[PDB]
């Protein structure tokens, strides 16, 4: 700011940047899809695991 000698715009953009300092708001969308995915995955995983464990001993 002390470089500029036309300074009446550095206060403008300083305050505008610090005003709009949140430039994007948070996203957590992986809490609805991740649990659903995890349920099907877990089910299938466990099914495979138990099935093959049984077969090994058979």
């Amino acid at each position: 700011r002390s470089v500029l000698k036309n300074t009446s715009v550095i206060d403008k953009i300083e305050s505008y940047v610090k005003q709009y300092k949140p430039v994007k708001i948070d996203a957590s969308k992986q809490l609805q899809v991740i649990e659903s995915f995890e349920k099907h995955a877990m089910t299938n995983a466990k099914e495979t695991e138990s099935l093959v464990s049984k077969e090994l001993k058979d």
């Binding site: 899809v33 991740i34 995915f37 099907h40 299938n44 099914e47 495979t48 099935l51 077969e55 058979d58």
Partner: protein, 85 residues
């Protein structure tokens, strides 16, 4: 994007390979196997099962029942010679 679910779906690897077919054969076959056989048949003492025991064993290729059995027919008709003469 989220990883797909192929690795965890196994139920077509249960027919997917050929030894599954062999497995379902020998889980029955070998499980229903006895330690040793039921019995081989060699004797039973009907008094001609004894004939089998001495002569018609699994390992007896010895010509002795043949000789004996031949000699039996010789004894039969030789007497019948004297039945007709």
């Amino acid at each position: 994007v989220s990883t797909l679910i192929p690795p965890k779906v196994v139920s077509s690897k249960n027919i997917g390979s050929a030894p599954n077919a062999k497995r379902i054969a020998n889980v029955v076959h070998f499980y229903k196997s006895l330690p040793q056989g039921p019995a081989p048949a060699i004797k039973a003492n009907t008094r001609l099962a004894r004939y089998k025991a001495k002569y018609f064993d699994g390992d007896n290729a010895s010509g002795k029942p043949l000789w004996h059995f031949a000699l039996g027919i010789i004894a039969f008709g030789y007497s019948m010679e004297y039945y007709f003469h």
